[PDB]
Design a protein around this ligand. Sequence first.
Ligand SMILES: *[C@@H]1O[C@H](CO)[C@@H](O[C@@H]2O[C@H](CO)[C@@H](O)[C@H](O)[C@H]2NC(C)=O)[C@H](O)[C@H]1NC(C)=O
Ligand SMILES: *[C@@H]1O[C@H](CO)[C@@H](O[C@@H]2O[C@H](CO)[C@@H](O)[C@H](O)[C@H]2NC(C)=O)[C@H](O)[C@H]1NC(C)=O
Ligand SMILES: CC1(C)Cc2c(-c3ccccc3)c(-c3ccc(Cl)cc3)c(CC(=O)O)n2C1
Ligand SMILES: *[C@@H]1O[C@H](CO)[C@@H](O)[C@H](O)[C@H]1NC(C)=O
Ligand SMILES: [Fe+3]
Ligand SMILES: [Zn+2]
Ligand SMILES: [Zn+2]
Length: 341
Amino acid sequence: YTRVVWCAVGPEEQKKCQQWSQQSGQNVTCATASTTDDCIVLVLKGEADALNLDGGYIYTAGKCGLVPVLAENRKSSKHSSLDCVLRPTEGYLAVAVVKKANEGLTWNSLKDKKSCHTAVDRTAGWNIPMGLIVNQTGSCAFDEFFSQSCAPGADPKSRLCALCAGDDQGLDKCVPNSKEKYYGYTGAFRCLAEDVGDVAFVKNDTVWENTNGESTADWAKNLKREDFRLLCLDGTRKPVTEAQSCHLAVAPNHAVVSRSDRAAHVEQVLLHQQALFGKNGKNCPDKFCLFKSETKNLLFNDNTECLAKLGGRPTYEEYLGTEYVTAIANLKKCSLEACAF
Ligand SMILES: *[C@@H]1O[C@H](CO)[C@@H](O[C@@H]2O[C@H](CO)[C@@H](O)[C@H](O)[C@H]2NC(C)=O)[C@H](O)[C@H]1NC(C)=O
Ligand SMILES: *[C@@H]1O[C@H](CO)[C@@H](O[C@@H]2O[C@H](CO)[C@@H](O)[C@H](O)[C@H]2NC(C)=O)[C@H](O)[C@H]1NC(C)=O
Ligand SMILES: CC1(C)Cc2c(-c3ccccc3)c(-c3ccc(Cl)cc3)c(CC(=O)O)n2C1
Ligand SMILES: *[C@@H]1O[C@H](CO)[C@@H](O)[C@H](O)[C@H]1NC(C)=O
Ligand SMILES: [Fe+3]
Ligand SMILES: [Zn+2]
Ligand SMILES: [Zn+2]
């Protein structure tokens, strides 16, 4: 009765989870909710066991008692002797991306421009840039900084949702799941690509993976890396090959979380499921690939090489790092340490 009930966020994740469930012979089954917060609630009620989360959502789950279990680990350079499951994670770079042709937009002229964010509460798309912005402006009024935005999860009538597009029928505008056209890393970068916004807060890998033919999706297939610049905190603009010297932060990798009392079982089941369906898996590309979903980053980021063991049985605070947790705490003061639910 180590069936693990995964929580899928929206219908496209639910469809992938259903295929995973079928292929796993119901070793894994699926609960679904409309939002990441709602999935965390199902886990707190014991109606789902686990899901994989961005760091800002790990902060929410962690305040309510849930614990990190395994982390996404993507390709690396050095440390290459180690098996992926054992290799330390390296964090990803949160960046602010603009079009080269939008000349003289820099970090210091962002006020009153249009912004694209992966979702409220997420690390690169929200906590890092809005925390930096609140700090730099000396003001908690971050909902009045950009003239319009798409920030999935904000009030859909507010200017923080004015750029969001909803689903193809145009329903579900601004919902924080993949139905919203501009949701997530891929959606916020598409929001910039399509010039709906002036700036997208995403990570370094997003720009690479959706330019120069790395994506064949209709909106991405013609994008050229050279037509984008990163915004540096010192006011300069750099090419996207320079993200090691022009990022807003290094983010902790997305990780699986669960109730502490289920962490051990969730871990062993996931280790076995990735041996089947993960990057070199017995049954991938054969039957099912757990870490593919045609660039849509459903359940896991498509660039995940494996889910890796954590060193030191970390608490969510240790996993996130004290400085990130403190930055989050500070930003949340704009809108005392109990579970949000
Ligand atoms: C930014 O992201 C890109 C995409 O993940 C990284 O480029 C990949 O890096 C490895 C080398 O580590 C190459 O083998 C891959 O083939 C690259 N992918 C692509 C699409 O080019 C890049 O290294 C990252 N930059 C920084 C500074 O972290
Ligand atoms: C925004 O500013 C706050 C206030 O300075 C930052 O909070 C401090 O962070 C440092 C470095 O971790 C700690 O030494 C201080 O104790 C923190 N101060 C407080 C009052 O808690 C926060 O890191 C900043 N946000 C961002 C995104 O950089
Ligand atoms: C295993 C972690 C989830 C803990 C952690 C810290 C961390 C933890 C404790 C105290 C400080 C940092 C930092 C990290 C790395 C670099 C910067 Cl500039 C900021 C944070 C990173 C990203 C990285 O791998 O380099 N991680 C990943
Ligand atoms: C299902 O779970 C059992 C128990 O670990 C295991 O023997 C079997 O290999 C698993 N099968 C699949 C298809 O995940
Ligand atoms: Fe993230
Ligand atoms: Zn840095
Ligand atoms: Zn510890």
